């Protein structure tokens, strides 16, 4: 999965998540993206996948 596509699937680049007086670039908020950490898969003690 290219990182670029994974970075679109992230609510921090959703334009509807800002504030009127929260100024500046998006990078001033969550920071400067460096790397995709990987896709996280959750499982319980019974090995069911969880979302």
């Amino acid at each position: 999965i290219p990182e670029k596509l994974a970075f679109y699937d992230y609510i921090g680049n959703n334009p509807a998540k800002g504030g009127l007086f929260r100024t500046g670039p998006m990078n001033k908020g969550d920071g400067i993206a460096q790397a995709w950490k990987g896709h996280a898969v959750f499982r319980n003690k019974e090995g069911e996948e969880l979302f």
Binding site: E3, Q34, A35, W36
Partner: protein, 244 residues
């Protein structure tokens, strides 16, 4: 022909290595019971390539082309050394002396200037084994030393150095020295380079050969103050072989 200084001066040709006719594709026979020498070795870089810093996510760095800003001051020349015949048959050139370093500054996109010591100091370059003649498919591979770009007396803008200079940041008398140590403490690096020299022209009669080279080495680290870059250098070379 026989040109004179006054013919060349100011033209840029003094920074060019000599060349061989398109019709020099002979071979220089190598007499194992003989001793040989490179009487002049000339290297003339034509392109300077710098490895870009693949961001944390990385994937793979590339070698990006660069712009030269220091003019026709780049060539290595008058380099001499003995050409030994090894007993597996190979040839080994051992640099003795010559004008074997040029400081060069190239510029990357964005405006980052990358100085380097383009060099083959202490070059040792060998052929494959069982080489009875030098031909238009003969390659040498070698390695050289790359000393620090500045030497030990060199003083930074705040007067700090290795063999001379302030040992602290005297303009910030009561700063914590600990955050400044990497810039206060100068370090002299010595690293190794690698070079291939691919013979492509041979005048069996005169002992002149000519070809292309590629070398890989590090750039300046500013006596330890920052990380160097990997540089790939490409160009052409000329050499005359005399029996010793």
């Amino acid at each position: 022909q026989t040109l004179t200084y006054d013919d060349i001066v100011g033209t840029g040709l003094a920074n060019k290595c000599p060349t061989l006719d398109d019709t020099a594709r002979g071979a220089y026979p190598i007499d194992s019971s003989q001793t040989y020498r490179i009487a002049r070795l000339c290297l003339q870089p034509t392109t300077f390539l710098v490895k870009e810093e693949p961001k944390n996510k990385r994937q793979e760095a590339e070698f990006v082309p660069t712009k030269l800003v220091t003019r026709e001051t780049t060539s290595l020349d008058q380099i001499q050394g003995e050409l030994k015949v090894n007993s597996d048959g190979s040839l080994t050139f051992v640099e003795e002396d010559g004008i074997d370093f040029q400081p060069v500054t190239v510029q990357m996109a964005g405006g980052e200037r990358i100085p380097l010591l383009f060099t083959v100091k202490n070059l040792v370059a060998s052929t494959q084994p069982n080489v009875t003649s030098i031909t238009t498919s003969t390659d040498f591979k070698g390695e050289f030393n790359v000393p620090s770009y500045r030497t030990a007396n060199f003083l930074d803008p705040k007067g700090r150095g290795l063999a001379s200079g302030y040992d602290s940041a005297i303009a910030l008398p009561q700063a914590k020295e600990e955050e400044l140590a990497r810039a206060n403490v100068k370090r002299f690096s010595l690293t190794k380079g690698q070079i291939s020299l691919n013979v492509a022209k041979v005048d069996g009669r005169t002992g002149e050969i000519a070809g292309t080279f590629e070398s890989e080495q590090l750039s300046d680290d500013d006596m330890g103050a920052h990380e160097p870059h990997e540089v790939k250098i490409q160009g052409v070379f000329y050499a005359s072989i005399e029996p010793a």
